[PDB]
Amino acid sequence: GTSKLKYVLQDARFFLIKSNNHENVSLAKAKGVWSTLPVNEKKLNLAFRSARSVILIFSVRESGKFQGFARLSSESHHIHWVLPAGMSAKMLGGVFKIDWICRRELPFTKSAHLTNPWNEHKPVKIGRDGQEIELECGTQLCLLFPPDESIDLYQVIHKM
C-alpha cells in the first residue's frame, strides 16, 4: 500500500538524478549505490544531514521516463560506471549507499501536470542532474510511480 511509502516521504527532500546511460542505473539497482559529480555530491551530503529522508529520482537521458527512486542511506565514501565523453573515474569516486523504494518506470507523459517551483515551475522532468525538487512536487511525483511489490519498506523505515 501507500501508507508506509507516505511515511518514508514525510518531510523528505527530493533530487532529480540524470544518467547519461541505462547501464549506470542498472548497476545502481543491482548494487544499491550511486555516485555523482562533486558539485552534486556536496549538495547530497549536506541534504543527508538535514532531512529525515533524501530521495533520488532517476531518469536516463533520452529515455522519456524515470526509472525509479531510492533513499540515501549514507553520505558519500571513497564500481565500474560507464563514463560519458569527458567524465572521469575520479569525479565519480564518491559512493553513496541507497535503498530502492521503486524500481519501476514512470513515463514523463504521466508527470506532465507536476511543475517544480525550484526550477522556474517547468515540468518536473526538466532539470539538470542534481536539481532539487520542492516537497509537494516531489511527493506527488513519487506517488505516481506504479507500486513496486518487490520492496518491503519496513527495513527502510528502520533506518530513519
Side-chain angles (χ1 to χ4, degrees), residues 1-30 32-41 43-51 53-60 63-79 81-86 88-89 91-96 98-109 111-127 129-135 137-148 150-160:
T2 81
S3 290
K4 284 206 287 300
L5 173 61
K6 286 168 166 178
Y7 186 83
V8 176
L9 299 181
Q10 259 289 304
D11 301 304
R13 296 178 70 175
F14 303 84
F15 296 85
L16 183 61
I17 296 299
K18 289 283 171 76
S19 175
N20 270 40
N21 47 75
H22 275 288
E23 284 55 42
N24 287 350
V25 171
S26 165
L27 204 40
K29 291 172 164 178
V33 291
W34 190 246
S35 297
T36 187
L37 294 197
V39 169
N40 285 342
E41 172 184 9
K43 311 170 32 151
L44 292 182
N45 274 338
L46 276 167
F48 181 81
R49 319 151 174 148
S50 87
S53 279
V54 177
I55 305 295
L56 311 191
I57 311 176
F58 290 82
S59 176
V60 171
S63 72
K65 300 163 182 171
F66 304 96
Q67 279 72 39
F69 60 98
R71 185 185 171 279
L72 286 191
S73 69
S74 83
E75 296 190 32
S76 63
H77 290 103
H78 295 64
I79 315 179
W81 306 112
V82 185
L83 303 83
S88 324
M91 321 206 50
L92 284 160
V95 183
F96 296 87
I98 63 183
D99 277 316
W100 286 87
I101 303 171
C102 177
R103 289 189 179 84
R104 312 264 317 261
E105 297 183 340
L106 182 77
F108 289 168
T109 46
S111 63
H113 60 296
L114 296 182
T115 56
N116 182 3
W118 303 149
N119 196 23
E120 309 181 354
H121 292 88
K122 295 172 178 190
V124 65
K125 66 182 129 273
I126 299 296
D129 181 47
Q131 166 75 55
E132 187 161 6
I133 305 168
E134 179 274 329
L135 181 278
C137 183
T139 298
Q140 286 324 302
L141 174 56
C142 288
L143 291 173
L144 286 175
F145 281 79
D148 186 341
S150 73
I151 297 301
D152 189 346
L153 291 181
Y154 176 81
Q155 293 81 354
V156 179
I157 291 178
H158 281 21
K159 304 192 178 190
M160 331 185 320

